[PDB]
Amino acid sequence: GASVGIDDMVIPEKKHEIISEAEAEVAEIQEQFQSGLVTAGERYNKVID
Amino acid sequence: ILSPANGEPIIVPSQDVVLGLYYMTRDCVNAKGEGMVLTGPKEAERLYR
Amino acid sequence: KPLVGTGMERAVAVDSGVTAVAKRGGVVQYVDASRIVIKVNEDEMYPGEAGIDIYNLTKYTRSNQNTCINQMPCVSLGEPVERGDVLADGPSTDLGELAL
Amino acid sequence: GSVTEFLKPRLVDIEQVSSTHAKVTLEPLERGFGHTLGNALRRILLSSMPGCAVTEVEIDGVLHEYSTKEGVQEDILEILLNLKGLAVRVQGKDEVILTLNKSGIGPVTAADITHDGDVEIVKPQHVICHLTDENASISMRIKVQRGRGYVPASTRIHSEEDERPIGRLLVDACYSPVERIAYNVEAARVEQRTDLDKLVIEMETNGTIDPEEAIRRAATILAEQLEAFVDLR
Amino acid sequence: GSVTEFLKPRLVDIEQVSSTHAKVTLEPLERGFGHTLGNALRRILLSSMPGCAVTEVEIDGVLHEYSTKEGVQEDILEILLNLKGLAVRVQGKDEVILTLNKSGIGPVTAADITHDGDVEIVKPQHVICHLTDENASISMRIKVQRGRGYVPASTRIHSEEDERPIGRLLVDACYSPVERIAYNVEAARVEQRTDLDKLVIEMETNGTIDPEEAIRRAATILAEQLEAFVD
Amino acid sequence: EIKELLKLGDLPTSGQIRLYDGRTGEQFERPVTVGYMYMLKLNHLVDDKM
Structure with a gap:
């Protein structure tokens, strides 16, 4: 009697902090690019990585 | 039973x-x-059922 | 009617011509499985007019896909109605809501 | 001695919550006998319970059930669907013709059916149709029989030895009078075995069958089926 | 036709691949009735058939289940398994003690059990244990009682007052003389309707009774239970 | 919101209840997801395809 439930697909509790740190790093890279230290291509590659 | 393309078996259980x-x-x-x-598989079946 | 819906069923049913929409408000003078006669209100009545509206429902008529087109009345005798209110539910329609 | 013998289950009381809902209590029972007997009774009751159902409908002003009549709010198909759910109790025969005659504004229910000595109406206020015209008269002839299971129209129209006159509409027959069965086995306190169990069966039916009669019929059917295993060539 | 009459299985055949293993095929049956009959018969055979089996084992020289005996190469649990695999037919009494004592090189069979004159051994050639030492003696007492169903030693660990002295090792119940009971429902084709079910029942008794006899006994028990609501 | 609505009625908040096998009657090992779903019948009739 196996079944699929909405609570079966558990979501990690640390996902939100990983997302927060990733977006903070992205914002820092964006502001550094705004400062002109890093060009558009390099900052795009860093954001993708 | 064997696929002529590669020789791997073609009758394999898939989903259930x-x-x-x-x-x-x-x-x-x-x-x-x-x-x-347990004394054997028959005893195991009797116990489970 | 769908137990879980999106609220767009009413708009689809009303906009489509399958259902019967009252042209003017009033009361249902006569309700039947085939025809509906509704006595319009005094304010909405045009001068020099009898003051009734007759809707002839289409019953068991073939469609382009060899299906059945049936319209069933949804109002009772003497029930007041307004403009834009559904009178007879068309095929795959429940009380003015889409029922696929 | 004690292990060789078995205690005898017995019906202890009948509880009638409503005209349809009912409770049946059986005790005493052994550890595993309840979960077997209740399941067998539930399986038997859902499929093999005789009951009365409507088969043929005759309307004076209707040629085919895919049409409409003047003065009735619902279609003839809707009238047939409503008549399909009608519940009646017939004793002494398995073939009854009922006549319904109505006229005037208002709902037409099962109370308008002419009352005979044998056939009785379990649900007198079961709504059948509605008359919305003052000068509208409706007359119907309803054919009811007794059977088992569900018999669709396709299987019944196989017997075309006698041609059916135009106007005799055929409806699907649902002879099963039991809708819901729920069994529960719990502890029973009789003497000091401290191991007996009692079974409570909740029955939701159409009110046309006595729960005690249903239980007795199911047990008799099971015993008749088990006679073959008892003999074993 | 009539609502009272019901279809009955008139095609009944028994295939005996062995004296123990049997297969009974019945056809035809009412739609869905085969499943109910098979489930009821399986449950009754599994947990409602009376029978005689060993309850506890008293071993001389061994006081704990995990202890080891140098005389017999097999361990204590293997000896218990072999002892519980034996089927004993007892009539006229419920609980009986059988004392066994063998001192010799070679296998120990059930035929060496002292004949009390009341119980019987269906399989006297059943292997009990193997001892390799020459000057080794294996002596013990077997308690066999009549009951019903399966009562594992975990459930019987309660009320230890009767088993307070050490050396009385509890053994698995195996009271019910039914092993490998299976039921299957297939499609049966007679006259026009073929929704009827054909029932195939596979049985493997322990040798005390014939599988057909056990099926008949189970059916008789069910009928005796159901007689309360008849006619 | 769905869990709150379920708790409003006499239903479990997990959305999975325990059933019993119809043929055997034995308990199911794990709870299953049973509810009410809108189902549509497609215009592919088997009698129109044979």
């Missing part, structure tokens, strides 16, 4: 048979009736 076999051939830790000794 493999799930049933996996559920059957799984080990718990504190399941009911753990630690007893």
Whole structure:
């Protein structure tokens, strides 16, 4: 009697902090690019990585 | 039984048979009736049923 | 009717011509499985007019896909109605809501 | 001695919550006998319970059920669907013709059916149709029989030895009078075995069958089926 | 036709691949009735058939289950398994003690059990244990009682007051003389309707009774239970 | 919101209840997801395809 439930697909509790740190790093890279230290291509590659 | 393209078997369970076999051939830790000794598969079937 | 819906069923049912929409408000003078006669209100009545509206429902008529087109009345005798209110539910329609 | 013998289950009381809902209590029972007997009774009751159902409908002003009549709010198909759910109790025969005659504004229910000595109406206020015209008269002839299971139109129209006159509409027959069965086995306190169990069966039916009669019929059917295994050539 | 009449299985055949293993095929049956009959018969055979089986084992020289005996190469649990695999037919009494004592090189069979004159051994050639030492003696007492169903030693661990002295090792119940009971429902084709079910029942008794006899006994028990609501 | 609505009625908040096999009557090992779903009948009739 196996079944699929909405609570079966558990979501990690640390996902939100990983997302927060990733977006903070992205914002820092964006502001550094705004400062002109890093060009558009390099900052795009860093954001993708 | 064997696919002429590569020789691999072509009659393999796909969706439900493999799930049933996996559920059957799984080990718990504190399941009911753990630690007893059975005289054979027939006794196991009688106990489970 | 769908137990879980999106609220767009009413708009689809009303906009489509399958259902019967009252042209003017009033009361249902006569309700029947085939025809509906509704006595319009005094304010909405045009001068020099009898003051009734007759809707002839289409019953068991073939469609382009060899299906059945049936319209069933949804109002009772003497029930007041307004403009834009559904009178007879068309095929795959329940009380003015889409029922696929 | 004691292990060789078995205690005898017995019906102890009948509880009638409503005209349809009912409770049946059986005790005493052994450890595993309840979960077997209740399941067998539930399986038997859902499929093999005789009951009365409507088969043929005749309307004076209707040629085919895919049409409409003047003065009735619902279609003839809707009238047939409503008549399909009608519940009646017939004793002494398995073939009854009922006549319904109505006229005037208002709902037409099962109370308008002419009352005979044998056939009785379990649900007198079961709504059948509605008359919305003052000068509208409706007359119907309803054919009811007794059977088992569900018999669709396709299987019944196989017997075309006698040609059916135009206007005799055929409806699907749902002879089963039991809708819901729920069994529960719990502890029973009789003497000091401290191991007996009692079974409570909740029955939701159409009110046309006595729960005690249903239980007795199911047990008799099971015993008749088990006679073959008892003999074993 | 009539609502009272019901279809009955008139095609009944028994295939005996062995004296123990049997297969009974019945056809035809009412739609869905085969499943109910098979489930009821299986449950009654599994947990409602009276029978005689060993309850506890008293071993001389061994005081705990995990202890080891140098005389017999097999361990204590293997000896218990072999002893519980034996089927004993007892009539006229409920609980009986059988004393066994063998001192010799070779296998120990059930035929060496002292004949009390009341119980019987269906399989006297059943292997009990193997001892390799020459000057080794294996002596013990077997308690066999009549009951019903399966009562594993875990459930019987309660009320230890009767098993307070050490050396009385509890053994698995195996009271019910039914092993490998299976039921299957297939499609049966007679006259026009073929929704009827054909029932195939596979049985493997322990040798005390014939499988057909056990099926008949189970059916008789069910009928005796159901007689309360008849006619 | 769905869990709150379920708790408003006499239903479990997990959305999975325990059933019993119809043929055997034995308990199911794990709870299953049973509810009410809108189902549509497609215009592919088997009698129109044979």
